[PDB]
Amino acid sequence: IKKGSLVKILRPESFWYNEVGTVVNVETSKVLYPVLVRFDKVNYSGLNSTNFSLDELVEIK
Amino acid sequence: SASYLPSILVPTVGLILPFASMAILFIAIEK
Amino acid sequence: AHTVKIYDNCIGCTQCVRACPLDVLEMVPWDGCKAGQMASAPRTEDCVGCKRCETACPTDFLSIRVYLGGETTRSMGLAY
Amino acid sequence: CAETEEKYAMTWSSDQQHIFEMPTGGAAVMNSGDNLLYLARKEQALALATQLRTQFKIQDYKIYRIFPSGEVQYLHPKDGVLPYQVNKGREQVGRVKSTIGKNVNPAQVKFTSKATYDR
Amino acid sequence: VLTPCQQSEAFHKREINEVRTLENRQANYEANSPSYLALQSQIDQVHKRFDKYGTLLCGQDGLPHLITDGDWRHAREFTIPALLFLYITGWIGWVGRSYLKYTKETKNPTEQEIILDVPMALKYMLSGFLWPLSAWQEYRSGQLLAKEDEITVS
Amino acid sequence: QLAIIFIWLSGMYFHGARFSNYVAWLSNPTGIKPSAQVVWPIVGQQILNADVGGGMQGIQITSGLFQLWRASGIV
Amino acid sequence: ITDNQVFVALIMALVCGYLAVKLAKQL
Amino acid sequence: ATKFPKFSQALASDPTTRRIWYGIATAHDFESHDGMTEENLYQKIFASHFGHLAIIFLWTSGNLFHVAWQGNFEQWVANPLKTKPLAHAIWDPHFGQAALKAFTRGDTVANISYSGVYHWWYTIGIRNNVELYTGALGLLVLSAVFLLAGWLHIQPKFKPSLSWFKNNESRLNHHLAGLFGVSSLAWTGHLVHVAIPASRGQHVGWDNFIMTPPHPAGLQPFFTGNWSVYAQSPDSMQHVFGTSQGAGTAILTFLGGFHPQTQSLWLTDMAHHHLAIAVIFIVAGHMYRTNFGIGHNLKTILEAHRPPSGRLGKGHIGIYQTLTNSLHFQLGLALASLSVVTSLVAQHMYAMPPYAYMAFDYVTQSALYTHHQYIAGLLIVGAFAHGAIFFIRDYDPEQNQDNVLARMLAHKEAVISHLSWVSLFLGFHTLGLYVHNDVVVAFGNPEKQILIEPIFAQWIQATSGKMLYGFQVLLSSSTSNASVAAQQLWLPGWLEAVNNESNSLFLTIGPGDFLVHHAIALGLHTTTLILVKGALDARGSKLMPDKKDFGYSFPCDGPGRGGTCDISAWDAFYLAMFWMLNTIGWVTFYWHWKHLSLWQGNVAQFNESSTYLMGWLRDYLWLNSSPLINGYNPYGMNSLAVWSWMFLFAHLVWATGFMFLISWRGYWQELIETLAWAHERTPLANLIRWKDKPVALSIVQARLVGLVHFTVGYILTYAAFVIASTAGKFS
Amino acid sequence: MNLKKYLSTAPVVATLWLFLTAGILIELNRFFPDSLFY
Numbered sequence A: 001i002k003k004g005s006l007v008k009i010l011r012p013e014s015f016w017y018n019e020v021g022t023v024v025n026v027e028t029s030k031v032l033y034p035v036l037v038r039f040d041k042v043n044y045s046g047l048n049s050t051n052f053s054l055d056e057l058v059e060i061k
Numbered sequence B: 001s002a003s004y005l006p007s008i009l010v011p012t013v014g015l016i017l018p019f020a021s022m023a024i025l026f027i028a029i030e031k
Numbered sequence C: 001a002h003t004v005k006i007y008d009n010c011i012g013c014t015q016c017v018r019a020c021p022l023d024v025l026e027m028v029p030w031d032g033c034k035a036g037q038m039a040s041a042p043r044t045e046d047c048v049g050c051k052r053c054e055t056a057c058p059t060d061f062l063s064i065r066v067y068l069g070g071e072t073t074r075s076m077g078l079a080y
Numbered sequence D: 001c002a003e004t005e006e007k008y009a010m011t012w013s014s015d016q017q018h019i020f021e022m023p024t025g026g027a028a029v030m031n032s033g034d035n036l037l038y039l040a041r042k043e044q045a046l047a048l049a050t051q052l053r054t055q056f057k058i059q060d061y062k063i064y065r066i067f068p069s070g071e072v073q074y075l076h077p078k079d080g081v082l083p084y085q086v087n088k089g090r091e092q093v094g095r096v097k098s099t100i101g102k103n104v105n106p107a108q109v110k111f112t113s114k115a116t117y118d119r
Numbered sequence E: 001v002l003t004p005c006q007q008s009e010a011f012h013k014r015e016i017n018e019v020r021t022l023e024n025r026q027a028n029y030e031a032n033s034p035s036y037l038a039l040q041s042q043i044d045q046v047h048k049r050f051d052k053y054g055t056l057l058c059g060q061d062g063l064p065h066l067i068t069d070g071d072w073r074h075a076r077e078f079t080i081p082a083l084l085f086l087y088i089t090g091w092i093g094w095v096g097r098s099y100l101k102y103t104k105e106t107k108n109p110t111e112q113e114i115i116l117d118v119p120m121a122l123k124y125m126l127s128g129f130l131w132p133l134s135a136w137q138e139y140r141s142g143q144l145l146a147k148e149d150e151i152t153v154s
Numbered sequence F: 001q002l003a004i005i006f007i008w009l010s011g012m013y014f015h016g017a018r019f020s021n022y023v024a025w026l027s028n029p030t031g032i033k034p035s036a037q038v039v040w041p042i043v044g045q046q047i048l049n050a051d052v053g054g055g056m057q058g059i060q061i062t063s064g065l066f067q068l069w070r071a072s073g074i075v
Numbered sequence G: 001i002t003d004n005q006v007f008v009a010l011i012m013a014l015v016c017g018y019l020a021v022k023l024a025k026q027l
Numbered sequence H: 001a002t003k004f005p006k007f008s009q010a011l012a013s014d015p016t017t018r019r020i021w022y023g024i025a026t027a028h029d030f031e032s033h034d035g036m037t038e039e040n041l042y043q044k045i046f047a048s049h050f051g052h053l054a055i056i057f058l059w060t061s062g063n064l065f066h067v068a069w070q071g072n073f074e075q076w077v078a079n080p081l082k083t084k085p086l087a088h089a090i091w092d093p094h095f096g097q098a099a100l101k102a103f104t105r106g107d108t109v110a111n112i113s114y115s116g117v118y119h120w121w122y123t124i125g126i127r128n129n130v131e132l133y134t135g136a137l138g139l140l141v142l143s144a145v146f147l148l149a150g151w152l153h154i155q156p157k158f159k160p161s162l163s164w165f166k167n168n169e170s171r172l173n174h175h176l177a178g179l180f181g182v183s184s185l186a187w188t189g190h191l192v193h194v195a196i197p198a199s200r201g202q203h204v205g206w207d208n209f210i211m212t213p214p215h216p217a218g219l220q221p222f223f224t225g226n227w228s229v230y231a232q233s234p235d236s237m238q239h240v241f242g243t244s245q246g247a248g249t250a251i252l253t254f255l256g257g258f259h260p261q262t263q264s265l266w267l268t269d270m271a272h273h274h275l276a277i278a279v280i281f282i283v284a285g286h287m288y289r290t291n292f293g294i295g296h297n298l299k300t301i302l303e304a305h306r307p308p309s310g311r312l313g314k315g316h317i318g319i320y321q322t323l324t325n326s327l328h329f330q331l332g333l334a335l336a337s338l339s340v341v342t343s344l345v346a347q348h349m350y351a352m353p354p355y356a357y358m359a360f361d362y363v364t365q366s367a368l369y370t371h372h373q374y375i376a377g378l379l380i381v382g383a384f385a386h387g388a389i390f391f392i393r394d395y396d397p398e399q400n401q402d403n404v405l406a407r408m409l410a411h412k413e414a415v416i417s418h419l420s421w422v423s424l425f426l427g428f429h430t431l432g433l434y435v436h437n438d439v440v441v442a443f444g445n446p447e448k449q450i451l452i453e454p455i456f457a458q459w460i461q462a463t464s465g466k467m468l469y470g471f472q473v474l475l476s477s478s479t480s481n482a483s484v485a486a487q488q489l490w491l492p493g494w495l496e497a498v499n500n501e502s503n504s505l506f507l508t509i510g511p512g513d514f515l516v517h518h519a520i521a522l523g524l525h526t527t528t529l530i531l532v533k534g535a536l537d538a539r540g541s542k543l544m545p546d547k548k549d550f551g552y553s554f555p556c557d558g559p560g561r562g563g564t565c566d567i568s569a570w571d572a573f574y575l576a577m578f579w580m581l582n583t584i585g586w587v588t589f590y591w592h593w594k595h596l597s598l599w600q601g602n603v604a605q606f607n608e609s610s611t612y613l614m615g616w617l618r619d620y621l622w623l624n625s626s627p628l629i630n631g632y633n634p635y636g637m638n639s640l641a642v643w644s645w646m647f648l649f650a651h652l653v654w655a656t657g658f659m660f661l662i663s664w665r666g667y668w669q670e671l672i673e674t675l676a677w678a679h680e681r682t683p684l685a686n687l688i689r690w691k692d693k694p695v696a697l698s699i700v701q702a703r704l705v706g707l708v709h710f711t712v713g714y715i716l717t718y719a720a721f722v723i724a725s726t727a728g729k730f731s
Numbered sequence I: 001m002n003l004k005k006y007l008s009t010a011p012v013v014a015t016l017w018l019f020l021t022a023g024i025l026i027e028l029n030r031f032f033p034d035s036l037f038y
């Protein structure tokens, strides 16, 4: 929801499913996948920074 | 013991059956 | 023909079209992303299916998926 | 061959007699004014389009798809526009509502003539 | 049948065969040759080698078999190097786990596994000695395991 | 690369010097089998030291260095 | 051990061959 | 329908040569055709089952006919130790002159039937060629019956309804009762009426089998339950199999153990055996409901087994749905159960040799075991291959909502990690110990070996009476509970067979048993690491979760995301077929080198020279291929010249497999373009143009055809070496 | 200064360490050869 929040994912096809990651971008411009999140570890394409929607976006405290 | 029968059946199934069966299957590709 | 389907992860960064050596994929103005772009695959009759798009598809997991369908003359890519 | 297969005729124009490389192999003379090139398959032709375009300005180029009944087609360019550049004329086909995450299981497509992504 | 090894006859036949067969090479050299001295030390390394197998069980082959039941009459065969070995790779496993859960939180963890922090590496290299009651005290703390890590579809 | 080759050839001339039976081989070449490398005596592998004559054993050369040295005239 | 039973055998498997082509040209 | 794949229009439009190969390899893939729905599927596999059964009975009528007509069967009956069992005769026009002198056995030039068939037909009670002809006609008739049914149930109004196919409920009421229970009961009706009297000398052919009862008094004072009369007078000691000397007249005596003379099981034991198995299966046929309604609803049998412990998901609720609707689950259980049955068959054909004068010809016994082990491994790999086909093209995790199967796909990570652990452990602790023993033996010292006595197998042989170890437990101790408990019934006839070292039952055991049996468990756990891997990661992995969308044998995903060579669920097949041939490799090398030490006699030749690897490559491959590879010389040839040829032939199969396995397509796809350029451009051949366009083999086919040459080369090489090795050291 | 950082890399530490444990086994098998007990 907010920038910089540590966020676990709930979409089973991501490489980072059930792994927390830091929110880079939150866009408020009707984008279906507005929240650009990057990570510590890296998938097979060499690309940690991906993006997600709000339903697949669980913050922690 | 009809000993002459392999001298008939072993060629007519060993070679000429995979000639005409090549014809039947391979024309049967186009039928 | 190799059915190329382009899902809604397609943030329109055009490495698919610039990566495809067949112009089966173009870019379509689609007001659903930040860049306003989303690729399309109209001419999948020319689609080889070499999956050079899915190499250079920097989405989360593969907005553009190339399903290996039928094999015509052009989709087999034979020279003669 | 030209009696039964589609020959792809890349036509283009230039300014100087440079030297490019054929997809057949080996260098070609590169007529300066305007020149055609009959090719075999499309990846050769657009590989020549990348062969020229990543070197220098070669634009106003496109293959006429010679199919053996006689007529032509217009590949590459299609719309006076470069394909990764966005023109507001290309109507999108080949999309679904979401990611792979909502594709149906193939035990629901089983014994039916559908696809695992159609929804 | 597992005979006690010090009185198996074919075992002693292997003693005669390797001492005498190795002594066939000793019939080439003079009394002060360094080769000949090496075969003196080698014959020592055969008689000691066979007298130090006096409590094994060489069967019908004259070859010393083992036992892995933990009979406590044969614990020096297997279970004592079993406990010893599991201590050594519980050391190595605990050192590797402790070092990775160090460098998981550093500045550049990718650089930390190429270039080992020999400060913190040789910290943990030695510090993983009491790993049974360090893993048993981290396991009661809810820290040895993990939960809700990566998984595929289903 | 030439540094590794000179380390290698200096290795061959030193293994010919210290470890080999080359001076003994030069007496009767057709009887004494050529050997340089004298295996260290650990468990069992002292059996690799072949009694190749020359009053000293070790694993046998097949690289033919001694035939290059007799042609060279190394005495 | 005889010859006539061999003829009877290839008759019965010739008929069985007609059931093989008979089943074969329906599935 | 238009061209070739009269069944798939996705391949009839293909102009290449792929329409041929995929037209062949997807022919039996009935779940993926043009418009073949469920009723049109079961009504085709049900007919093709009949075509298959008629192929089986045509084949067994083939063996009956060649043994009936070209074999030496009754001359073999005269002297079953001396004369070799002849197979079908030869007609080569290629055997010039010197070959024919290396095959004449009488007037015939026939092959020597190394398939154990005369033994089984000799214990059945076939003592003539006439009964073989009447049996061969009796199976040509039966194959005509099965072809009649498969042709008959594809005739349209006799194509049965799918609700009949979904009477899953009652097939088990009829297979367990009729197919298994009655027929085995009927097989006692053979053994009581044929094998017992024609073993005890009485030629009970098809005449007097209703006028000569197998017991001299029978069935009018025998509904009264005086059943000890049928086990009254056994065949004790002084009998040769076939005559009437030294034999009693009891039918169902359970002595246990072997013959003294033929070293096979008693046919009284098999008559009583199939009779008891018959009664227990007929009892098991009364298990499920039907139109009557006295039995078990299967939904009430998988629904009820949800534990209140709660650990095992929401129980099996969902399993009965995914066996009716599925087929690859049902075929996976079928190949699993048949495969474990085959391995049980193999582990008992040598151990308890059933057939008289087997374990006397040492080649047929060496071929039956290896035969059923390679068929055993093939059918396990079929069970897991259709397991992965079940998890892709047949699995519904919404009818399997948090089911036992969905629980399996949940903890598949722990499953594959622990299979990989035990396979790694055994692979560093067989190969570690063989390279230890081989270095140490190599360094002039066989004594400094690690030999671990396999005490658990020695203790289990002590539980079955093998007194040669000194444990003195349940049956080895003659005073225990089980030792007294069957002291009259079957023990003293059986412990003689156990404590003997002639027979192949409960063998004497060195540490080669230890190191090899760990190598076998390495093979099982690697092969299930692969199969359970690409059966549980068959559906979706973290490399690509799209895998369920692509079907079973999709090729790859391209170079994207690092490279994706062999990600499919077909790879687990493709690799665990190598591990199948390897593992069954070590099983049959171990068995065959154990029995080339027993049959030669020098068991110490095994136990001293099998604990390390040059014991195998020296004492078994280098030495026992000597009468093989002398199959033909520049001095002449002998009868082994077939196998020594086949041997070499099979190497040429095997390494051609590597041409497809190692070197993949895009080499050849740009080499066929040179061949088609050269064919198009040349004169006198540009007239003869192809119709199907020449295209190199696709990379599922290519890995498959390289696998097929790997199997055919492997199995023909080892079938050459078993038979030429034992037939060279003997016969 | 940075030489020790080269001596802290993966293969150099792996050879200075596996050289050391290999030295433990080789020196512990000259001194105590043929150790099948314990």
Ligand code: CLA
Pocket (backbone or CB within 6 Å): E092, E093, E094, E095, E096, E097, E099, E100, E116, E121, E124, E125, H417, H418, H420, H421, H424
């Ligand atoms: C950090 C050290 C470490 C630790 C604690 C473990 C622990 C484990 N591994 Mg392992 N592994 C490691 C390193 C480690 N691994 C490395 C470096 C590799 C690459 C070779 C592997 C490859 C590997 C495979 C392929 C498998 C395991 C498995 C397992 C589990 C079963 C135990 C086993 O058989 O080990 C396996 C041990 C080995 C394969 C060899 C030992 C690994 C190295 C050489 C020893 C550790 C030294 C390490 C480099 C020290 C670094 C720290 C130091 C510099 C300060 C266990 C949780 C298995 C599993 O999933 O079971 C549940 C399994 O199948 N591991």
Ligand code: CLA
Pocket (backbone or CB within 6 Å): H045, H046, H049, H050, H053, H164, H165, H167, H168, H170, H171, H174, H175, H177, H178, H179, H341
């Ligand atoms: C009593 C009635 C009866 C009987 C005898 C059968 C018999 C058969 N049915 Mg069937 N069926 C029945 C009722 C019956 N059915 C009913 C009522 C239904 C409807 C609910 C069906 C529905 C049905 C379907 C849908 C299918 C069959 C099929 C089959 C065939 C199985 C394949 C086969 O031959 O395996 C033979 C197997 C054995 C003999 C035993 C194998 C395993 C044992 C344990 C090992 C062998 C024993 C021994 C150790 C080895 C001896 C070998 C020797 C060399 C020593 C078989 C002929 C299938 C088929 O192939 O179609 C024809 C098929 O698809 N049936």
Ligand code: CLA
Pocket (backbone or CB within 6 Å): H024, H025, H026, H027, H028, H029, H030, H335, H378, H379, H381, H382, H383, H385, H389, H552, H553, H570, H573, H708, H712
């Ligand atoms: C009764 C048992 C049984 C049955 C009914 C099936 C049925 C099926 N299997 Mg199958 N399978 C089985 C056992 C069985 N399998 C076993 C035991 C294994 C392990 C070896 C497999 C491994 C297997 C794989 C890997 C695949 C199947 C597939 C299939 C499906 C399509 C098969 C097809 O179209 O082939 C068409 C027919 C052929 C290809 C002919 C077979 C020729 C083979 C390849 C080589 C034999 C050539 C021979 C050795 C050369 C002779 C020369 C001589 C010198 C030896 C079908 C439902 C496929 C599937 O469902 O995926 C979509 C698939 O990919 N099966």
Ligand code: CLA
Pocket (backbone or CB within 6 Å): H420, H421, H423, H424, H425, H426, H427, H428, H431, H522, H526, H529, H530, H575, H576, H578, H579
């Ligand atoms: C000689 C042939 C060979 C060998 C040894 C192996 C060995 C192995 N395969 Mg395998 N495989 C082979 C051929 C072979 N394969 C072929 C032909 C195929 C078909 C392509 C496969 C397909 C296959 C699959 C599909 C799988 C395996 C797996 C495995 C591993 C099983 C677990 C185990 O036993 O670990 C014990 C480890 C060993 C036996 C390794 C050998 C020990 C080495 C030599 C010592 C370490 C190096 C040593 C110090 C030398 C240093 C070198 C020097 C330069 C410094 C094991 C490494 C599986 C796996 O990953 O399991 C976890 C797996 O899933 N294999």
Ligand SMILES: CC1=C(/C=C/C(C)=C/C=C/C(C)=C/C=C/C=C(C)/C=C/C=C(C)/C=C/C2=C(C)CCCC2(C)C)C(C)(C)CCC1
Pocket (backbone or CB within 6 Å): H329, H332, H333, H336, H340, H380, H383, H384, H386, H387, H388, H390, H535
């Ligand atoms: C993938 C898949 C699958 C698979 C397949 C298979 C292959 C399986 C496995 C399985 C198997 C392969 C089987 C096995 C089993 C096991 C067993 C069965 C064991 C046990 C044992 C026992 C039981 C024994 C014991 C004993 C004795 C020794 C004597 C006394 C008594 C008794 C009996 C107890 C399935 C279809 C399922 C599902 C789907 C998918």
Ligand SMILES: CC1=C(/C=C/C(C)=C/C=C/C(C)=C\C=C\C=C(C)\C=C\C=C(C)\C=C\C2=C(C)CCCC2(C)C)C(C)(C)CCC1
Pocket (backbone or CB within 6 Å): E068, E069, E070, E089, E090, E093, E094, E097, E131, E135
């Ligand atoms: C006694 C004996 C024996 C054995 C057996 C047994 C005992 C078995 C079982 C088995 C078992 C009983 C197992 C268990 C397991 C389980 C689990 C559950 C595991 C765990 C693991 C873990 C937890 C790991 C971790 C770790 C650690 C701990 C340390 C560090 C490293 C690591 C991290 C890796 C024998 C016969 C040999 C011999 C005689 C005696």
Ligand code: SF4
Pocket (backbone or CB within 6 Å): C009, C010, C011, C012, C013, C014, C015, C016, C017, C039, C056, C057, C058, C059, C063, C064
């Ligand atoms: S999908 Fe990946 S590649 Fe295709 S446009 Fe969007 S970003 Fe560029």
Ligand code: SF4
Pocket (backbone or CB within 6 Å): C002, C004, C019, C020, C021, C022, C024, C025, C047, C048, C049, C050, C051, C052, C053, C054, C066
């Ligand atoms: S499929 Fe092959 S060709 Fe068509 S776009 Fe994706 S990569 Fe380029």
Ligand code: SF4
Pocket (backbone or CB within 6 Å): H555, H556, H557, H558, H559, H563, H564, H565, H566, H699
């Ligand atoms: S090689 Fe061909 S098949 Fe194997 S991964 Fe690269 S692309 Fe996919």
